[PDB]
Amino acid sequence: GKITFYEDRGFQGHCYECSSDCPNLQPYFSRCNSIRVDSGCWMLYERPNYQGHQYFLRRGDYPDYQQWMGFNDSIRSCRLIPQHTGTFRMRIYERDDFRGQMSEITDDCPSLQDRFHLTEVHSLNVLEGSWVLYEMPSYRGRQYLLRPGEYRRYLDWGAMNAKVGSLRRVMDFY
């Protein structure tokens, strides 16, 4: 994977190229107003150590932070999300601790309200592949990376509430 962070808009100013997870990008650049992703799928974070707002980015040019739905110009850590091919599979539960009715999801789900008549998911289990969970339908609102693992309550995926509108598999366009 290869991503380049630039301090000013339109690929200008001081920059840094990254090829791997980095829990603290602040020693390399002071702010981020544009990004070019050359390869890989990445989760970027507002604060070091993978905290704050998160943003999912795939290959492409992002000449201003609105192109990645950024909240501001702070990008202080990043993960290169490991690539996975074949089946992505997760299970969502109506209550925490894997209780209530469970639904199994293996495709992108742009609206859990349309598909399951749910506005909230209170625990979920990611069996294969990484996913991005979005607070609102249609890949809107706050984003949260989900790697394989148990998430027995919403705090485990870093959210402030249980609202889950859509889920996207982390797949490169090809």
Short mmCIF file of N, CA and C in Angstrom, two decimals:
data_model
loop_
_atom_site.label_atom_id
_atom_site.label_comp_id
_atom_site.label_asym_id
_atom_site.label_seq_id
_atom_site.Cartn_x
_atom_site.Cartn_y
_atom_site.Cartn_z
N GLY A 1 0.86 -1.23 0.00
CA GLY A 1 0.00 0.00 0.00
C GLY A 1 0.86 1.23 0.00
N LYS A 2 0.34 2.29 -0.65
CA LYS A 2 1.06 3.54 -0.73
C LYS A 2 0.05 4.73 -0.68
N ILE A 3 0.27 5.59 0.30
CA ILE A 3 -0.61 6.76 0.44
C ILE A 3 0.30 7.98 0.70
N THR A 4 -0.03 9.14 0.20
CA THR A 4 0.75 10.36 0.42
C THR A 4 -0.18 11.45 0.96
N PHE A 5 0.22 11.99 2.11
CA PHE A 5 -0.52 13.02 2.83
C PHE A 5 0.13 14.38 2.53
N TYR A 6 -0.68 15.40 2.23
CA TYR A 6 -0.11 16.70 1.91
C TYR A 6 -0.69 17.76 2.88
N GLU A 7 0.16 18.72 3.26
CA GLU A 7 -0.32 19.70 4.28
C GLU A 7 -1.30 20.67 3.63
N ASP A 8 -1.18 20.99 2.36
CA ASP A 8 -2.05 22.02 1.76
C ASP A 8 -2.96 21.40 0.73
N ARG A 9 -3.98 22.15 0.29
CA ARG A 9 -4.90 21.57 -0.69
C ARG A 9 -4.20 21.34 -2.04
N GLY A 10 -4.76 20.41 -2.80
CA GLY A 10 -4.30 20.26 -4.21
C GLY A 10 -2.84 19.74 -4.29
N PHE A 11 -2.45 18.91 -3.33
CA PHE A 11 -1.16 18.20 -3.43
C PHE A 11 0.01 19.13 -3.26
N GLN A 12 -0.22 20.25 -2.57
CA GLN A 12 0.82 21.24 -2.37
C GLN A 12 1.42 21.15 -0.96
N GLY A 13 2.64 21.72 -0.81
CA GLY A 13 3.23 21.85 0.50
C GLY A 13 3.93 20.58 0.96
N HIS A 14 4.29 20.55 2.21
CA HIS A 14 4.99 19.39 2.80
C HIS A 14 4.14 18.16 2.78
N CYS A 15 4.79 17.03 2.47
CA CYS A 15 4.03 15.78 2.33
C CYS A 15 4.76 14.62 2.97
N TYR A 16 4.09 13.50 3.03
CA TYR A 16 4.72 12.28 3.60
C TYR A 16 4.08 11.10 2.92
N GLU A 17 4.93 10.17 2.44
CA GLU A 17 4.40 8.92 1.88
C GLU A 17 4.49 7.81 2.93
N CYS A 18 3.40 7.08 3.07
CA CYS A 18 3.25 6.02 4.07
C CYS A 18 2.91 4.71 3.39
N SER A 19 3.50 3.61 3.86
CA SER A 19 3.25 2.30 3.27
C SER A 19 2.81 1.28 4.25
N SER A 20 2.41 1.74 5.45
CA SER A 20 2.05 0.74 6.45
C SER A 20 1.23 1.41 7.56
N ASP A 21 0.75 0.59 8.53
CA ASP A 21 0.09 1.25 9.70
C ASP A 21 1.08 2.26 10.29
N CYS A 22 0.49 3.35 10.77
CA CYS A 22 1.35 4.33 11.53
C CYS A 22 0.46 4.94 12.64
N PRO A 23 0.84 4.67 13.91
CA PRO A 23 -0.01 5.15 15.01
C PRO A 23 0.26 6.59 15.34
N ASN A 24 1.22 7.26 14.73
CA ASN A 24 1.45 8.70 14.99
C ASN A 24 2.13 9.30 13.79
N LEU A 25 1.29 10.01 12.99
CA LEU A 25 1.85 10.65 11.80
C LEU A 25 2.30 12.09 12.07
N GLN A 26 2.02 12.61 13.26
CA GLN A 26 2.34 14.02 13.51
C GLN A 26 3.80 14.34 13.37
N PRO A 27 4.79 13.48 13.66
CA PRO A 27 6.19 13.90 13.41
C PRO A 27 6.46 14.11 11.93
N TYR A 28 5.60 13.62 11.02
CA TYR A 28 5.91 13.74 9.58
C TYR A 28 5.27 14.89 8.90
N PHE A 29 4.16 15.39 9.35
CA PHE A 29 3.41 16.48 8.74
C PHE A 29 2.44 17.04 9.74
N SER A 30 2.13 18.32 9.63
CA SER A 30 1.48 19.01 10.74
C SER A 30 -0.02 19.10 10.60
N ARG A 31 -0.47 18.90 9.34
CA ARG A 31 -1.91 18.98 9.00
C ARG A 31 -2.07 18.25 7.66
N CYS A 32 -3.30 18.02 7.28
CA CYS A 32 -3.52 17.28 6.01
C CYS A 32 -4.74 17.87 5.29
N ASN A 33 -4.44 18.49 4.13
CA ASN A 33 -5.49 19.07 3.32
C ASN A 33 -5.65 18.42 1.97
N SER A 34 -4.84 17.43 1.64
CA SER A 34 -5.09 16.65 0.41
C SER A 34 -4.32 15.31 0.56
N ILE A 35 -4.77 14.32 -0.20
CA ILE A 35 -4.20 12.96 -0.10
C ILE A 35 -4.31 12.31 -1.51
N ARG A 36 -3.24 11.61 -1.85
CA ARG A 36 -3.28 10.72 -3.01
C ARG A 36 -3.07 9.28 -2.52
N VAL A 37 -4.08 8.41 -2.78
CA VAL A 37 -3.86 6.98 -2.41
C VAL A 37 -3.46 6.28 -3.72
N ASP A 38 -2.25 5.78 -3.73
CA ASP A 38 -1.75 5.08 -4.93
C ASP A 38 -2.16 3.60 -4.91
N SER A 39 -2.19 2.97 -3.74
CA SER A 39 -2.58 1.56 -3.63
C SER A 39 -2.91 1.24 -2.16
N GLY A 40 -3.79 0.25 -2.05
CA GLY A 40 -4.26 -0.17 -0.73
C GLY A 40 -5.59 0.48 -0.36
N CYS A 41 -6.19 -0.12 0.68
CA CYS A 41 -7.39 0.45 1.32
C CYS A 41 -6.96 0.95 2.72
N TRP A 42 -7.37 2.16 3.04
CA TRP A 42 -6.80 2.73 4.27
C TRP A 42 -7.95 3.27 5.17
N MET A 43 -7.65 3.19 6.46
CA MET A 43 -8.51 3.90 7.45
C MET A 43 -7.61 5.02 8.03
N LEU A 44 -8.16 6.24 7.97
CA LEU A 44 -7.34 7.37 8.48
C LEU A 44 -8.08 7.87 9.78
N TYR A 45 -7.29 8.40 10.67
CA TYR A 45 -7.89 8.80 11.98
C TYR A 45 -7.44 10.21 12.32
N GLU A 46 -8.33 10.94 12.95
CA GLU A 46 -8.10 12.34 13.37
C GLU A 46 -7.00 12.43 14.45
N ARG A 47 -6.92 11.43 15.29
CA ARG A 47 -5.97 11.51 16.42
C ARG A 47 -4.97 10.34 16.34
N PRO A 48 -3.84 10.48 17.07
CA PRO A 48 -2.87 9.35 17.06
C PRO A 48 -3.51 8.15 17.72
N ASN A 49 -2.89 6.98 17.45
CA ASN A 49 -3.30 5.76 18.08
C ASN A 49 -4.70 5.35 17.70
N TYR A 50 -5.11 5.74 16.47
CA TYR A 50 -6.33 5.23 15.84
C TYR A 50 -7.57 5.67 16.62
N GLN A 51 -7.62 6.96 16.90
CA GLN A 51 -8.82 7.48 17.63
C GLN A 51 -9.35 8.68 16.89
N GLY A 52 -10.51 9.18 17.40
CA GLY A 52 -11.12 10.38 16.77
C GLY A 52 -11.98 9.94 15.59
N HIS A 53 -12.34 10.95 14.79
CA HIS A 53 -13.09 10.59 13.55
C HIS A 53 -12.17 9.65 12.71
N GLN A 54 -12.87 8.72 12.05
CA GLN A 54 -12.20 7.81 11.10
C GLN A 54 -12.74 8.07 9.69
N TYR A 55 -11.85 7.77 8.71
CA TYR A 55 -12.27 7.99 7.30
C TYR A 55 -11.67 6.84 6.45
N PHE A 56 -12.55 6.25 5.65
CA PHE A 56 -12.10 5.17 4.75
C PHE A 56 -11.75 5.75 3.38
N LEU A 57 -10.58 5.38 2.86
CA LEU A 57 -10.13 5.92 1.58
C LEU A 57 -9.55 4.70 0.75
N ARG A 58 -9.93 4.73 -0.52
CA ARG A 58 -9.40 3.78 -1.53
C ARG A 58 -8.61 4.60 -2.56
N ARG A 59 -8.04 3.90 -3.53
CA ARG A 59 -7.21 4.57 -4.52
C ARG A 59 -7.88 5.81 -5.12
N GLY A 60 -7.12 6.87 -5.26
CA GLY A 60 -7.73 8.04 -5.92
C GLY A 60 -7.00 9.28 -5.42
N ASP A 61 -7.44 10.39 -6.03
CA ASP A 61 -6.89 11.71 -5.67
C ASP A 61 -7.95 12.44 -4.83
N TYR A 62 -7.55 13.05 -3.75
CA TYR A 62 -8.48 13.76 -2.82
C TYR A 62 -7.91 15.14 -2.57
N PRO A 63 -8.20 16.15 -3.42
CA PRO A 63 -7.49 17.41 -3.41
C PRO A 63 -7.93 18.36 -2.29
N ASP A 64 -8.94 17.94 -1.49
CA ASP A 64 -9.40 18.74 -0.33
C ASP A 64 -10.06 17.76 0.68
N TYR A 65 -10.05 18.07 1.98
CA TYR A 65 -10.49 17.06 2.91
C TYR A 65 -11.99 16.72 2.83
N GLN A 66 -12.78 17.59 2.13
CA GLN A 66 -14.23 17.22 1.95
C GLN A 66 -14.30 15.97 1.04
N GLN A 67 -13.27 15.71 0.22
CA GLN A 67 -13.37 14.54 -0.68
C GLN A 67 -13.30 13.26 0.05
N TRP A 68 -12.82 13.25 1.35
CA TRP A 68 -12.85 12.03 2.16
C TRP A 68 -13.84 12.21 3.31
N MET A 69 -14.70 13.22 3.21
CA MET A 69 -15.70 13.51 4.24
C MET A 69 -15.00 13.87 5.58
N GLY A 70 -13.90 14.57 5.44
CA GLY A 70 -13.14 14.86 6.70
C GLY A 70 -13.83 15.93 7.50
N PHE A 71 -13.55 15.89 8.79
CA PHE A 71 -14.17 16.92 9.71
C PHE A 71 -13.32 18.16 9.75
N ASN A 72 -12.05 18.05 9.44
CA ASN A 72 -11.10 19.10 9.48
C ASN A 72 -9.78 18.63 8.82
N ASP A 73 -8.70 19.30 9.03
CA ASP A 73 -7.42 18.94 8.41
C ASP A 73 -6.49 18.18 9.32
N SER A 74 -7.03 17.45 10.29
CA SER A 74 -6.16 16.64 11.19
C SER A 74 -6.26 15.16 10.78
N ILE A 75 -5.11 14.61 10.41
CA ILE A 75 -4.96 13.17 10.13
C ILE A 75 -3.66 12.74 10.89
N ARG A 76 -3.83 12.01 11.97
CA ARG A 76 -2.68 11.77 12.86
C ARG A 76 -2.38 10.31 13.03
N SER A 77 -3.14 9.41 12.44
CA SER A 77 -2.74 7.99 12.39
C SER A 77 -3.46 7.35 11.20
N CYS A 78 -2.95 6.18 10.81
CA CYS A 78 -3.60 5.50 9.66
C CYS A 78 -3.31 3.99 9.75
N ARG A 79 -4.26 3.25 9.26
CA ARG A 79 -4.11 1.83 9.10
C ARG A 79 -4.22 1.45 7.61
N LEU A 80 -3.28 0.60 7.19
CA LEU A 80 -3.43 -0.06 5.86
C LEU A 80 -4.31 -1.29 6.11
N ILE A 81 -5.56 -1.25 5.65
CA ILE A 81 -6.45 -2.35 6.04
C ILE A 81 -6.08 -3.61 5.23
N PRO A 82 -5.85 -4.79 5.91
CA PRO A 82 -5.40 -5.93 5.09
C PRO A 82 -6.50 -6.34 4.13
N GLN A 83 -5.91 -6.61 2.97
CA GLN A 83 -6.70 -7.05 1.83
C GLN A 83 -7.28 -8.45 2.09
N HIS A 84 -8.50 -8.64 1.59
CA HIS A 84 -9.16 -9.94 1.77
C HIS A 84 -9.98 -10.21 0.47
N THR A 85 -9.81 -11.45 0.02
CA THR A 85 -10.69 -11.73 -1.18
C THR A 85 -11.56 -12.95 -0.80
N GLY A 86 -12.69 -13.03 -1.49
CA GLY A 86 -13.60 -14.18 -1.22
C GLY A 86 -14.75 -13.63 -0.35
N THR A 87 -15.16 -14.43 0.61
CA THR A 87 -16.36 -14.03 1.36
C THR A 87 -16.04 -13.08 2.51
N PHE A 88 -16.77 -11.98 2.54
CA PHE A 88 -16.74 -11.13 3.77
C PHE A 88 -17.99 -11.57 4.58
N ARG A 89 -17.85 -11.72 5.87
CA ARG A 89 -19.06 -12.19 6.59
C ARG A 89 -19.04 -11.55 8.01
N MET A 90 -20.13 -10.99 8.41
CA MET A 90 -20.30 -10.49 9.78
C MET A 90 -21.72 -10.84 10.23
N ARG A 91 -21.92 -10.79 11.53
CA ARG A 91 -23.24 -11.03 12.15
C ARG A 91 -23.59 -9.84 13.03
N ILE A 92 -24.81 -9.33 12.87
CA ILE A 92 -25.28 -8.21 13.70
C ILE A 92 -26.32 -8.76 14.70
N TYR A 93 -26.38 -8.11 15.85
CA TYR A 93 -27.29 -8.59 16.94
C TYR A 93 -28.09 -7.36 17.42
N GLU A 94 -29.36 -7.72 17.80
CA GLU A 94 -30.22 -6.57 18.26
C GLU A 94 -29.76 -6.08 19.61
N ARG A 95 -29.27 -6.83 20.55
CA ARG A 95 -28.81 -6.46 21.90
C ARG A 95 -27.31 -6.68 22.03
N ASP A 96 -26.75 -6.14 23.07
CA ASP A 96 -25.31 -6.30 23.28
C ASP A 96 -24.97 -7.71 23.72
N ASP A 97 -23.69 -8.00 23.69
CA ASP A 97 -23.25 -9.34 24.10
C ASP A 97 -23.84 -10.43 23.24
N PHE A 98 -24.05 -10.16 21.96
CA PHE A 98 -24.54 -11.16 20.96
C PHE A 98 -25.87 -11.75 21.40
N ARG A 99 -26.80 -10.89 21.81
CA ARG A 99 -28.15 -11.33 22.18
C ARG A 99 -29.21 -10.69 21.28
N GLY A 100 -30.40 -11.22 21.38
CA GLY A 100 -31.50 -10.84 20.47
C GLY A 100 -31.31 -11.55 19.10
N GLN A 101 -32.17 -11.16 18.16
CA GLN A 101 -32.09 -11.73 16.80
C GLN A 101 -30.76 -11.29 16.13
N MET A 102 -30.27 -12.31 15.45
CA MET A 102 -28.99 -12.14 14.72
C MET A 102 -29.28 -12.13 13.22
N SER A 103 -28.59 -11.29 12.49
CA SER A 103 -28.69 -11.38 10.99
C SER A 103 -27.24 -11.52 10.46
N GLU A 104 -27.09 -12.32 9.43
CA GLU A 104 -25.76 -12.55 8.84
C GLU A 104 -25.60 -11.76 7.55
N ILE A 105 -24.55 -10.95 7.40
CA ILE A 105 -24.40 -10.03 6.26
C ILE A 105 -23.07 -10.40 5.54
N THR A 106 -23.19 -10.58 4.24
CA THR A 106 -22.04 -10.93 3.41
C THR A 106 -21.93 -10.02 2.21
N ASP A 107 -22.75 -8.96 2.18
CA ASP A 107 -22.61 -8.03 1.06
C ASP A 107 -22.64 -6.57 1.57
N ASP A 108 -22.41 -5.60 0.69
CA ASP A 108 -22.53 -4.22 1.19
C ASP A 108 -24.02 -3.99 1.52
N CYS A 109 -24.26 -3.30 2.61
CA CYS A 109 -25.66 -3.04 3.00
C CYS A 109 -25.90 -1.57 3.10
N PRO A 110 -26.43 -0.91 2.07
CA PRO A 110 -26.51 0.57 2.13
C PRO A 110 -27.58 1.05 3.07
N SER A 111 -28.52 0.20 3.51
CA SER A 111 -29.49 0.64 4.50
C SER A 111 -29.94 -0.52 5.37
N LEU A 112 -29.46 -0.53 6.62
CA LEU A 112 -29.99 -1.59 7.51
C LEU A 112 -31.48 -1.30 7.84
N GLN A 113 -31.88 -0.05 7.74
CA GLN A 113 -33.34 0.21 8.00
C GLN A 113 -34.20 -0.40 6.90
N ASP A 114 -33.86 -0.23 5.66
CA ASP A 114 -34.58 -0.84 4.54
C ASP A 114 -34.50 -2.37 4.64
N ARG A 115 -33.32 -2.91 4.92
CA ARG A 115 -33.19 -4.38 4.80
C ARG A 115 -33.71 -5.08 6.03
N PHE A 116 -33.46 -4.50 7.22
CA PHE A 116 -33.82 -5.25 8.46
C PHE A 116 -34.76 -4.47 9.35
N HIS A 117 -35.21 -3.29 9.00
CA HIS A 117 -36.07 -2.46 9.83
C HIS A 117 -35.36 -2.18 11.17
N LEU A 118 -34.03 -2.01 11.08
CA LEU A 118 -33.22 -1.66 12.30
C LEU A 118 -32.63 -0.25 12.05
N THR A 119 -32.53 0.54 13.11
CA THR A 119 -31.81 1.79 13.17
C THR A 119 -30.54 1.66 14.04
N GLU A 120 -30.49 0.63 14.87
CA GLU A 120 -29.34 0.45 15.79
C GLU A 120 -28.92 -1.04 15.73
N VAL A 121 -27.59 -1.19 15.98
CA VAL A 121 -27.05 -2.57 16.17
C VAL A 121 -26.23 -2.55 17.45
N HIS A 122 -26.47 -3.46 18.39
CA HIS A 122 -25.90 -3.31 19.73
C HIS A 122 -24.72 -4.21 20.00
N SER A 123 -24.50 -5.20 19.11
CA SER A 123 -23.20 -5.96 19.16
C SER A 123 -23.13 -6.61 17.76
N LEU A 124 -21.89 -6.94 17.37
CA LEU A 124 -21.70 -7.56 16.05
C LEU A 124 -20.42 -8.41 16.08
N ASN A 125 -20.37 -9.42 15.23
CA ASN A 125 -19.18 -10.33 15.20
C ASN A 125 -18.66 -10.37 13.76
N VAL A 126 -17.41 -9.94 13.55
CA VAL A 126 -16.87 -9.96 12.15
C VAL A 126 -16.06 -11.24 12.01
N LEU A 127 -16.58 -12.13 11.16
CA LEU A 127 -15.96 -13.45 10.99
C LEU A 127 -14.88 -13.41 9.93
N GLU A 128 -15.07 -12.71 8.82
CA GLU A 128 -14.06 -12.73 7.73
C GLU A 128 -14.14 -11.36 7.01
N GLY A 129 -12.94 -10.86 6.66
CA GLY A 129 -12.75 -9.62 5.94
C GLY A 129 -12.91 -8.46 6.93
N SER A 130 -12.40 -7.31 6.48
CA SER A 130 -12.65 -6.05 7.20
C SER A 130 -13.81 -5.29 6.50
N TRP A 131 -14.48 -4.48 7.33
CA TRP A 131 -15.70 -3.74 6.91
C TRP A 131 -15.59 -2.30 7.45
N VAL A 132 -16.37 -1.40 6.87
CA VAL A 132 -16.57 -0.08 7.44
C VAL A 132 -18.04 0.05 7.85
N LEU A 133 -18.24 0.36 9.12
CA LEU A 133 -19.59 0.59 9.67
C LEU A 133 -19.84 2.13 9.61
N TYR A 134 -21.03 2.51 9.15
CA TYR A 134 -21.41 3.91 9.07
C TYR A 134 -22.67 4.14 9.92
N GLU A 135 -22.55 5.25 10.65
CA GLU A 135 -23.63 5.69 11.53
C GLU A 135 -24.96 5.85 10.76
N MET A 136 -24.94 6.34 9.54
CA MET A 136 -26.19 6.65 8.78
C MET A 136 -26.25 5.85 7.50
N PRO A 137 -27.48 5.70 6.94
CA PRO A 137 -27.65 4.93 5.70
C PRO A 137 -26.86 5.55 4.58
N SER A 138 -26.59 4.65 3.59
CA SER A 138 -25.89 5.15 2.38
C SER A 138 -24.50 5.67 2.64
N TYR A 139 -23.83 5.06 3.64
CA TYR A 139 -22.37 5.30 3.85
C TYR A 139 -22.16 6.76 4.24
N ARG A 140 -22.98 7.18 5.20
CA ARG A 140 -22.99 8.55 5.71
C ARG A 140 -22.72 8.54 7.22
N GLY A 141 -22.42 9.74 7.73
CA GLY A 141 -22.21 9.99 9.16
C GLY A 141 -20.85 9.44 9.61
N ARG A 142 -20.72 9.19 10.89
CA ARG A 142 -19.37 8.79 11.36
C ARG A 142 -19.07 7.36 10.88
N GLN A 143 -17.81 7.14 10.61
CA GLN A 143 -17.32 5.85 10.08
C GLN A 143 -16.53 5.11 11.14
N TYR A 144 -16.60 3.81 11.10
CA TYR A 144 -15.84 3.00 12.08
C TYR A 144 -15.32 1.75 11.37
N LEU A 145 -14.00 1.58 11.39
CA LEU A 145 -13.39 0.33 10.86
C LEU A 145 -13.73 -0.86 11.73
N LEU A 146 -14.16 -1.95 11.12
CA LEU A 146 -14.39 -3.21 11.76
C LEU A 146 -13.43 -4.28 11.19
N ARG A 147 -12.44 -4.70 11.93
CA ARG A 147 -11.55 -5.83 11.47
C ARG A 147 -12.08 -7.11 12.01
N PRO A 148 -11.72 -8.31 11.61
CA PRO A 148 -12.27 -9.52 12.20
C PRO A 148 -12.13 -9.54 13.71
N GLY A 149 -13.20 -9.91 14.39
CA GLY A 149 -13.18 -9.87 15.86
C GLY A 149 -14.61 -9.73 16.38
N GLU A 150 -14.72 -9.92 17.68
CA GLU A 150 -15.96 -9.77 18.44
C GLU A 150 -16.11 -8.32 18.86
N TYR A 151 -17.33 -7.75 18.69
CA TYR A 151 -17.61 -6.37 19.16
C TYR A 151 -18.90 -6.49 20.00
N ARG A 152 -18.69 -6.73 21.28
CA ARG A 152 -19.81 -7.09 22.18
C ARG A 152 -20.65 -5.88 22.54
N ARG A 153 -20.14 -4.70 22.25
CA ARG A 153 -20.95 -3.48 22.45
C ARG A 153 -20.44 -2.36 21.57
N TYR A 154 -21.21 -1.30 21.35
CA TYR A 154 -20.80 -0.31 20.34
C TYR A 154 -19.50 0.37 20.66
N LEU A 155 -19.15 0.45 21.98
CA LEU A 155 -17.86 1.12 22.33
C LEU A 155 -16.70 0.35 21.73
N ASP A 156 -16.90 -0.96 21.47
CA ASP A 156 -15.77 -1.75 20.93
C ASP A 156 -15.41 -1.32 19.50
N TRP A 157 -16.36 -0.69 18.75
CA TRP A 157 -15.97 -0.20 17.42
C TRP A 157 -15.72 1.32 17.45
N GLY A 158 -15.71 1.88 18.69
CA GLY A 158 -15.30 3.27 18.89
C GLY A 158 -16.44 4.26 18.76
N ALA A 159 -17.69 3.86 18.62
CA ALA A 159 -18.77 4.83 18.38
C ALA A 159 -19.27 5.46 19.68
N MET A 160 -20.04 6.50 19.50
CA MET A 160 -20.68 7.27 20.62
C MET A 160 -22.12 6.81 20.80
N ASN A 161 -22.65 6.02 19.90
CA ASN A 161 -24.03 5.52 20.00
C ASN A 161 -24.14 4.25 19.16
N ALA A 162 -25.27 3.59 19.22
CA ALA A 162 -25.51 2.31 18.59
C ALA A 162 -26.11 2.45 17.21
N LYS A 163 -26.22 3.70 16.71
CA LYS A 163 -26.83 3.93 15.40
C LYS A 163 -25.95 3.28 14.29
N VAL A 164 -26.60 2.42 13.52
CA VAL A 164 -25.75 1.81 12.41
C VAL A 164 -26.68 1.82 11.16
N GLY A 165 -26.30 2.59 10.17
CA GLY A 165 -27.12 2.80 8.98
C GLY A 165 -26.66 1.93 7.83
N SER A 166 -25.36 1.66 7.69
CA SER A 166 -24.89 0.93 6.49
C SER A 166 -23.55 0.29 6.80
N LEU A 167 -23.22 -0.73 5.98
CA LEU A 167 -21.97 -1.48 6.20
C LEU A 167 -21.33 -1.69 4.80
N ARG A 168 -20.04 -1.44 4.71
CA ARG A 168 -19.37 -1.61 3.38
C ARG A 168 -18.17 -2.56 3.59
N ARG A 169 -18.03 -3.55 2.67
CA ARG A 169 -16.84 -4.43 2.76
C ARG A 169 -15.62 -3.68 2.30
N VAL A 170 -14.48 -3.99 2.98
CA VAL A 170 -13.25 -3.27 2.53
C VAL A 170 -12.57 -4.06 1.41
N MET A 171 -12.96 -3.59 0.20
CA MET A 171 -12.51 -4.22 -1.07
C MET A 171 -11.90 -3.14 -1.95
N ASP A 172 -10.82 -3.51 -2.56
CA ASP A 172 -10.24 -2.50 -3.52
C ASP A 172 -11.22 -2.40 -4.71
N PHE A 173 -11.25 -1.40 -5.58
CA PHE A 173 -12.28 -1.45 -6.64
C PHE A 173 -12.17 -2.74 -7.45
N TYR A 174 -11.01 -3.39 -7.56
CA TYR A 174 -10.78 -4.65 -8.25
C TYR A 174 -10.21 -5.72 -7.33
#
